[PDB]
Symmetry: C3
Subunit: 146 residues, 3 copies
């Protein structure tokens, strides 16, 4: 499937931007490597393997979204990528993750992916957004608003 | 969620993210870059249904920037490859992602799912990013990398 | 045609990520600029020019893969992007290079690209992965590994 290879390709780019983020903001290495691990596992299942990837994974993202949000304050306006370099790469990560989300959904409608795959990616982009806001807040970088 | 529209919007989001990376790396151009990001968000917004009278004045604004920034540059006699100062390399990348976003919006031009001004702007923008990449290398004393 | 344009765009994105790597790890600038030079020559050929880009290019890449791999030990894990910043960007380069490969291979089937283009790009992604490990090895950054 040219569709399968596309999805895998979007996933590889995502894992790569994630590594960039990790390299720039080591403090989040532990959390980002776990997300990268999950992406590789998702990639392996789409490729034909079976890691028994379950919904527990998605709830795990939800939990992170919640715990990191406790540091943030209200999305007053719309945020434009900016601030700390790592924050800007988290935005890039969010965008690539969303592209990978569209690709996985495409395979999902043909039964070549699991709903948990598309769902995990759906929550992941949200978490990536929260992490960009977190980086700017910890490093005292104002977010850029529209 | 018409795959062609969400795709165009995805490319635009990536473009604004790369532009943010440039701004982080070269804060001396943040003011100019944020204005470009604001324009990308407006374009994106209109394509998503929220028209905001995005005017062709925007395009003129870019052509003007292209003109004033080139005044700093010598006549070019080589094909430039991405390189030099880190911000210059990312500007070249912004341009490449801008050209990809340009393609998705042009596709939306048919069926009139996007304005003709959106496509025009993106086109001039990719040219501006090229000029800015050269400007950054010139101001930081970084030779441009050239083909061959 | 839109196929050609998309292929050219992926090659252009690839060349830019390579430029980013060079700026971050200047000690590899000479070899990375040669790859950038070939990507541009390849793009030119797809756009209509002729640089007489030959299999000799491909062989040059395999030689680089071989020689750089000599600094490395046997690999017993799947490596995830990480470590030194330039290593993470080489992985990105590899990913975008694979995307460019897919587009060029699509042109191959319609005789809008040369077989040497596709093969060059296929070898290139392998070289990029090796360069990523070499960078981490030389800068004492452990590779990130699945699990």
């Amino acid at each position: 499937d040219s569709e399968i290879v596309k999805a895998l390709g979007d996933l590889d780019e995502l894992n790569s931007v994630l590594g960039v983020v990790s390299s720039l903001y080591p403090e989040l290495s532990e959390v980002i490597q776990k997300l990268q691990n999950d992406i590789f596992s998702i990639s392996s299942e789409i490729a034909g393997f079976d890691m028994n990837f379950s919904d527990e994974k998605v709830k795990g993202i939800e939990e992170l979204i919640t715990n990191y949000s406790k540091e943030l304050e209200p999305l007053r306006n719309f945020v434009l990528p900016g601030g700390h370099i790592a924050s800007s790469f988290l935005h890039l990560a969010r965008a690539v993750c969303r592209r990978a989300e569209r690709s996985v959904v495409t395979l999902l409608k043909e039964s070549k992916a699991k709903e948990v795959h598309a769902k995990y990616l759906n929550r992941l982009s949200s978490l990536l957004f929260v992490l960009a806001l977190v980086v700017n807040k910890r490093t005292n970088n104002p977010n850029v608003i529209w």
